[PDB]
Design a protein around this ligand. Structure first.
Ligand SMILES: Nc1ncnc2c1ncn2[C@@H]1O[C@H](COP(=O)(O)OP(=O)(O)OP(=O)(O)O)[C@@H](O)[C@H]1O
Ligand SMILES: Nc1ncnc2c1ncn2[C@@H]1O[C@H](COP(=O)(O)OP(=O)(O)OP(=O)(O)O)[C@@H](O)[C@H]1O
Ligand SMILES: [Mg+2]
Ligand SMILES: [Mg+2]
Lengths: 108, 51, 70, 405, 395
């Protein structure tokens, strides 16, 4: 959260790399903790409002285990398109919200 | 004559069916509802028969 | 449906009935075996019931295998 | 045991009435057919597309029990039939209330979820289940016959062009009841609220009610007309109650214009049907004082009063803040008399031997009502002789008819 | 105009889309008081309809054998009947008292829930729920009057600790009096805006009722519901409607209104303590009020809203011309000097008429000449209809 707040909207390479390293170094059971939810947020804070600069970041996040991968991807994508009004991204988010699950899988 | 007899026998059962209240219509509403005032019993929002 | 597109983006006239034949009381007046068949009924086929059949030929007898009770 | 605590602040219903509800789409600017308005409309359209797809999906995988028509049918089943009409006596909790049926028996029942809980206020007519008396709805109260009595349904046909000589009076009344509605930007840019009240005073027949009719013709606000003598009731407190309800109805139909015609007649006339004497009239006047300028916040309600005896009114009633403008209607002068005669004979077919100059001085204290009566009675005399052309003899008989005898 | 065809196309599409959305979601009826379907908890509604039984409202009358383990309660079920019942197992015996409203079931009428006392809906609506848009900054020339009013009606509620420590009992009643338009109701609205306790506005004409004893009943219920709050303020605007002095004119002259006033007086200072209610009355005819109502313990403070002096009139002119688009050199002191005995309402009308004179001339700025004409029209020309000279004999 801090390193994101210092480097908010800056697309800092060092912060992105170390956040990715921390995220993929953690175990799948470790990612069940909600404090891990802050790891993408700072990453998302790094690329706040940048837009289409997350495709490399999204490709990197693809290797992360699930359901934390969906949470991280949604967080960073939203932070990238923050304050833009892109109706396409809102449509994607509403499609994510459409399919409901009978909690653990539905965090994102 | 048989129809008269049959109607007479069914009339005994028909007369035991409860009578209908008499009300005054305040106004019709949507979805075939009517605001009525039963004579001693205030107001009601009642349905309307299909006929 | 997919996502909405946003701003940007010949009955037959006869039937062959095998033996035995489930024949209606009305079917009897309209049922008649093929002419070329090797068997010919004794009484008219419209009478119904159990009918003996004269055999025109003396070939092998392709009888009907009895079925077993349930 | 502990009493329940409501989560809603206050006990009154929501002030907003008759809104666009869910159709409150954002106001797109500019109204000009430009690409920016086009883009804003497209953005609204894309949000509506996304909403439509989402709602369709949710209803698609919703259970057969949970469907819009199925849920409406379940609401109907929960309400049952018939639905009794009771009175909301008290809101004990968010989902609990004390309601009294028409037989006078009270019940502590439960307010169901589908009830519009912001429509619930004490004394409001509620719809209850026939068996369990649980609140299942709120009955939209029909318009009161008194509401119909005040409201002027059809605008009067008298326009400002039918008024002669009252140029200054027309200007003053327009600055208070017409200009604030048609051109509020003047007042907003000047930093002043419009003149609050207006009272039209003058000798009888000078055109006060005619000017009120002209205002009612060219107004976009609801027009309520009440005669002062109508405020005198037969029972104690019914006068103040009537004034309170008149201004409540005025507040309901905002913007509105309240025309209290012949206000002085509340005091200058004594009727034996008034149980309370001058004291009940004074209490009604105090209620009128509170309504004109009192504790309760007043919406877009404009008050017009008319009287031919303004010296008999309580000075606190017409004080500034209650009635800002006091417009005088003097007896017409010769120019105004000629204009009035031309106005009321415009549809007439006058004879060549009839001159309005002679009729201008029929009486020294001639008013517009006298001139209109002269014209009407002269037309009546022409009708008696089966004529369409009004002669000077007809007007001569008219003068001796209306003015004298 | 080049976009007009596409404008109408997309507008019609939006309207059709809105109708389609309303088709699936809801928004209909609204005459039977139906909430939007997004708030429909139908399963909970069914569970409430089954589990939560209706309860008829009755009034407990007498408790027989309250000491023993079988206390019987005589209840009066409104217009229905009278019964001898027992409490349900879920109600403590000490939670039901004689004379209080209870709610009982329809089968055995056993008392199920104690209920709040019955209050007239007209009395309930008298409490203020939307505070007025007037602050103390909108009242000019009443510094001492506002201070005296606040240290009685606002300070004890805000900081009671300053009073209990010194054994100090603050005054519990204020009468604002003065000529019409001087700012009595304006100061009351300021109090209601600043107050945090329950504020109830009562107009004297609202206490006049058709039937005998009804006004006293409304006063009693007003003070009953005012006592159901930790701190409360009751405003009696135009108290001279019912607060007139008692008299005997042979006939029954104002007997019922005198009984209403006597009930109000008994509630203010009688055998029973009033409570934490701090009353506030405003009238332009304080000479007509009953001497018992004008007595300390019922109206402890008597704040006079006399006509503003020169400084007060200048302050009012500044207050009302604050948002005016006035010229640069408006001599508001001169304007205040030009209307010696004028209420604040006349000053507000002077400002409004100066603005109207400027507007009528199609000018966006009001000059000093406009204010002079406004003074001539309001203070001088309208002086025939002034309520001031007659009403300062009453105050
Ligand atoms: N100045 C005028 N110009 C034209 N017509 C007039 C004028 N004054 C009066 N009239 C006519 O006289 C009729 C009656 O006058 P109106 O009722 O308006 O008078 P009023 O001053 O309100 O009287 P009242 O005091 O009796 O209520 C009007 O309908 C109108 O046709
Ligand atoms: N001291 C003041 N400072 C500023 N404005 C004032 C002052 N006094 C009166 N006004 C203005 O004049 C108006 C007069 O209305 P207000 O409710 O104050 O009168 P009132 O004293 O209650 O009169 P009444 O005795 O007729 O009820 C106020 O709404 C306000 O705009
Ligand atoms: Mg008239
Ligand atoms: Mg007042």
């Amino acid at each position: 959260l801090a390193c994101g707040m210092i480097a908010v909207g800056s697309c800092n390479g060092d912060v992105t790399s170390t956040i990715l390293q921390t995220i993929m170094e953690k175990s799948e059971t470790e990612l069940k903790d909600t404090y891990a939810r802050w790891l993408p947020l700072g990453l998302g804070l790094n690329h706040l409002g940048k837009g289409e600069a997350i495709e490399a970041i999204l490709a990197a996040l693809e290797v992360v285990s699930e359901p934390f991968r969906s949470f991280a991807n949604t967080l960073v994508d939203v932070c990238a398109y923050a304050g833009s009004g892109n109706v396409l991204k809102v449509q994607q988010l509403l499609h994510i919200c459409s399919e409901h699950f009978d909690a653990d899988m539905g965090a994102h | 004559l048989n129809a008269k007899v049959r109607l007479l026998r069914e009339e005994l059962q028909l007369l035991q069916e409860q009578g209908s209240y008499v009300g005054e219509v305040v106004r019709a509403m949507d979805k075939k509802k009517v605001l009525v005032k039963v004579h001693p019993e205030g107001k009601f929002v009642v349905d309307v028969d299909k006929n | 449906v997919s996502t909405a597109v946003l701003s940007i983006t010949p009955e037959p006239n006869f039937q062959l009935l095998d033996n035995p034949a489930r024949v209606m009381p009305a079917q009897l007046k309209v049922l008649t075996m093929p002419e070329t068949c090797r068997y010919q009924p004794f009484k008219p086929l419209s009478i119904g019931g159990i009918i003996i059949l004269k055999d025109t030929s003396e070939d092998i007898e392709e009888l009907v295998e009895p079925v077993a009770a349930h | 045991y502990e009493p329940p605590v409501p989560t809603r602040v206050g006990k009154k219903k929501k002030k907003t009435k008759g809104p666009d509800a869910a159709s409150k789409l954002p106001l797109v600017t500019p109204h000009t057919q430009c690409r920016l308005k086009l883009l804003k409309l497209e953005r609204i359209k894309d949000y509506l597309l996304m909403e439509e797809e989402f709602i369709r999906n949710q209803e698609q995988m919703k259970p057969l029990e949970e469907k819009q028509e199925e849920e409406r049918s379940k609401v109907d089943d929960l309400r049952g039939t018939p639905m009794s009409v009771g009175t909301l006596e008290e809101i004990i909790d968010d989902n609990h209330a004390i309601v009294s049926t028409s037989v006078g028996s009270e019940h502590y029942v439960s307010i169901l979820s589908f009830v519009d809980k912001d429509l619930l206020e004490p004394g409001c007519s509620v719809l209850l289940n026939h068996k369990v008396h649980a609140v299942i709805g709120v009955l939209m109260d029909d318009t009161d016959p008194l509401v119909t009595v005040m409201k002027v349904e059809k605008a009067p046909q008298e326009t400002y062009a039918d008024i002669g000589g009252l140029d200054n009076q027309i200007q003053e009344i327009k600055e208070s009841v017409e200009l604030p509605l048609t051109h509020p930007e003047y007042y907003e840019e000047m930093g002043i609220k419009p003149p609050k009240g207006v009272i039209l005073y003058g000798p009888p027949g000078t055109g006060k009610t005619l000017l009120a009719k002209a205002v009612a013709n060219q107004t976009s606000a609801t027009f309520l007309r009440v005669v002062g003598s109508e405020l005198i009731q037969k029972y104690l407190g019914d006068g103040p109650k009537l004034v309170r309800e008149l201004f409540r109805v005025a507040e309901e139909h905002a913007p509105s214009i309240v025309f209290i015609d012949e206000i002085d007649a509340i005091g200058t006339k004594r009727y034996d049907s008034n149980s309370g004497g001058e004291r009940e009239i004074q209490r009604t006047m105090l209620e009128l004082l509170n309504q004109l300028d009192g504790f309760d916040s007043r919406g877009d309600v404009k008050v017009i009063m008319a009287t031919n005896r303004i010296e008999t009114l309580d000075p606190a009633l017409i004080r500034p803040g209650r009635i800002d403008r006091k417009i005088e209607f003097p007896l017409p002068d010769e120019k105004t008399k000629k204009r009035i005669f031309q106005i009321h004979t415009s549809r007439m077919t006058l004879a060549d031997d009839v001159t309005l100059d002679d009729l201008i001085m029929a009486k020294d204290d001639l008013s517009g009502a006298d001139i209109k009566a002269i014209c009407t009675e002269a037309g009546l005399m022409a009708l008696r002789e089966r004529r369409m052309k009004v002669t000077n003899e007809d007007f001569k008989k008219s003068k001796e008819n209306v003015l004298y005898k | 105009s080049t976009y007009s065809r596409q404008i109408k196309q997309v507008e019609d599409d939006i309207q059709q889309l809105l109708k389609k959305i309303n088709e699936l979601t809801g928004i209909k009826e609204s005459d039977t008081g139906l909430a939007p379907p997004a708030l429909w908890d139908l399963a909970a509604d069914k569970q409430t309809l089954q589990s939560e039984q209706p309860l008829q409202v009755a009034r407990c009358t007498k408790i027989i054998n309250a000491d023993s383990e079988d206390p019987k309660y005589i209840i009066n079920v409104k217009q229905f009947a009278k019964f001898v019942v027992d409490l349900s197992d879920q109600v403590a015996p000490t939670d039901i008292e004689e004379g209080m409203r209870v709610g009982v079931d329809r089968n055995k009428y056993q008392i199920h829930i104690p209920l709040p006392p019955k209050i007239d809906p007209t009395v309930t609506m008298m409490q203020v729920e939307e505070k007025p848009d007037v602050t103390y900054s909108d009242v000019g020339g009443c510094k001492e009057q506002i201070e005296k009013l606040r240290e009685v009606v606002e300070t004890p509620l805000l900081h009671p600790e300053r009073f209990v420590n010194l054994g100090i009992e603050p005054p519990k009643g204020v009468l604002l009096f003065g000529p019409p338009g001087t700012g009595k109701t304006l100061c009351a609205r300021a109090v209601a805006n600043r107050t945090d306790a329950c504020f109830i506005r009562v107009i004297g004409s609202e206490l006049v009722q058709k039937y005998v004893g009804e006004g006293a009943r409304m006063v009693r219920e007003l003070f009953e519901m005012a006592r159901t709050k930790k701190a409360c303020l009751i405003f009696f605007d135009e108290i001279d409607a019912i607060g007139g002095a008692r008299f005997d004119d042979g006939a029954g002259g104002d007997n019922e209104v005198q009984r209403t006033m006597l009930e109000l007086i008994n509630q203010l200072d009688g055998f029973d303590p009033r409570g934490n209610i701090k009353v506030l009355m405003a009238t332009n005819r304080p000479d007509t009020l009953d001497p018992a109502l004008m007595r300390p313990g019922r109206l402890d403070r008597k704040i006079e809203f006399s006509l503003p002096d020169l400084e007060g009139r200048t302050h009012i002119f500044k207050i009302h011309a604050r948002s005016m688009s006035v010229e640069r050199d408006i001599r508001f002191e001169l304007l205040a000097r030009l209307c010696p005995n004028s209420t604040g309402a006349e000053i507000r009308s002077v400002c409004t008429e100066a603005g109207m004179f400027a507007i009528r001339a199609r000018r966006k700025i009001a000059t000093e000449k406009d204010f002079l004409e406004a003074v001539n029209k309001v203070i001088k020309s309208y002086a025939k209809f002034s309520a001031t000279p007659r009403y300062m004999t009453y105050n």
